A and B are shown apart, each in its own frame.
With several copies, the nearest count.
Chain A
Amino acid sequence: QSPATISLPQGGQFRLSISNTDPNMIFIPGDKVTAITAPGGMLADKRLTRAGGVLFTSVATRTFTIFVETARGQTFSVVATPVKGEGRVYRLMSAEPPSRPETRKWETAQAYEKLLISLNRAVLTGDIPDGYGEVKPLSDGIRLPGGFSVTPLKAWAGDQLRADRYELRNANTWGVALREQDFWKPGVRAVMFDNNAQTLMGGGRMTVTVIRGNGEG
């Protein structure tokens, strides 16, 4: 199995199965859990993983609500109903990116065009800057011309900037020229095509990385 992904805003209420018998795990991709709170006498054990997760065991059988608070300022609520079975692992995506004060300092110390190139290289080369963290991709962040459909893949976000990758499929099978300017939306700060492209064949599975601003809208 791959860990299941919850993706909740910073008030989220997700009902998820939990196991009475074996330990269960919750991790934040980009944040360190600092505390888990449940009703007294409900969660039998609670230990913090080094990576930044939390492992917990519940012995009771009633459905209950648990609250998780991450260090960089975050709170998510899950209602956990205990069922018989294996331990479950859930990955918690923020949906609303966290404020990262220590990242703004790196972000603003350099020039704008240099920063754009750096984020774009990192996404392309697969190494992520230290200050950035993983977030849920935006449903609609780019304009869709010529009857296209877009499937988001991954997104990352810092303090004033936010990167996402979108898979574009050409559905009209007739040849469509590609211009970064035609995908521009209020808030889209930069667009790069991973393959040089300039053209899109009739069946196209290509990708595009867009940098935007955090908090636009």
Chain B
Amino acid sequence: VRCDNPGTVHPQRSRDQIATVWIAPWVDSDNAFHQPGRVSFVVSPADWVLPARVN
């Protein structure tokens, strides 16, 4: 029943959280119309989630 070894965990990396913002139509300084679109950015990147339980 005696077991003698350091434990093992599984590294877990969390998913990135993304955010998308819709843009309304717009005209720039060069007078070109820009129909509605969207641009996505990452708010919180992925990282290791240290273990709740080592054993």
Taken residue by residue from 178 to 214, chain A's Cβ proximity to chain B (1 for < 8 Å, 0 otherwise) reads as: 0111101010111111101010000000000000000
B21 to chain A, nearest CB (A): 4
Identify which of residues 15-54 in chain B touch chain A, using a CB-to-CB cut-off of 8 Å: 18-24, 26-32, 34, 36, 38-39, 41, 43, 52, 54
Shortest CB-to-CB span from A114 to chain B, Å, is 7
Main secondary structure of the interface of B (DSSP, over half): loop
Contact (Cβ within 8 A) A182 B6: yes
Chain A residues with Cβ below 8 Å from B20 are: 180, 192-193, 196
Contacts of A196 in B (CB 8 A): 10, 18-20
Residue in chain A with minimal CB distance to B2: A177
A116 touches B39 (CB 8 A): yes
Residues in A with CB closer than 8 Å to B24 are: 184, 188-191
Interface-facing stretch out of A27-35, A58-66, A73-81, A103-111: A103-111
Question: Is residue A174 within 8 Å, beta carbon to beta carbon, of the partner chain?
Answer: no
Hey, which chain B residues are within 8 Å of A191, CB to CB?
Answer: 21-22, 24
Nearest B residue to A184 via CB reads B54
Q: Are A181 and B2 in contact (CB under 8 A)?
A: no
A107 contacts B21, CB within 8 Å? no
Given contacts A117-B41, A181-B5, contact A105 B22 (CB under 8 A): no
Do the beta carbons of A112 and B26 come within 8 Å of each other?
yes
Contact of A186 among B26, B32, B43, B52 (CB under 8 A): B52
What is the CB-to-nearest-CB distance from A162 to chain B, in angstroms, rounded to a whole number?
Answer: 14
- B53, closest chain A residue (CB): A184
In the complex, what residues of A have CB within 8 A of residue B31's CB? 105
Q: Which residues of B contact A184 (CB under 8 A)?
A: 6-7, 24, 54-55
Complex Cα gap A119–B2 (Å)? 30
Residues in B with CB closer than 8 Å to A186 are 52
CB distance from A178 to the nearest CB of B (A): 9
Contacts of B4 in A (CB 8 A): 177, 179, 198
In chain A, positions 131-185 with a C-beta closer than 8 Å to chain B are: 177, 179-182, 184
27 A/B residue pairs, CB under 8 Å, sorted by A: A105-B29, A107-B28, A113-B23, A113-B34, A116-B23, A116-B39, A117-B39, A117-B41, A120-B21, A121-B43, A124-B19, A177-B3, A179-B4, A179-B5, A180-B38, A181-B36, A181-B54, A182-B6, A182-B55, A184-B6, A188-B24, A189-B23, A189-B24, A189-B26, A190-B21, A190-B24, A191-B21
- Could you list 10 further interchain pairs (A-B, Cβ under 8 angstroms) beyond the known A105-B28, A117-B30, A190-B22? A106-B29, A108-B29, A109-B34, A113-B32, A120-B41, A180-B20, A180-B22, A180-B38, A184-B24, A189-B24
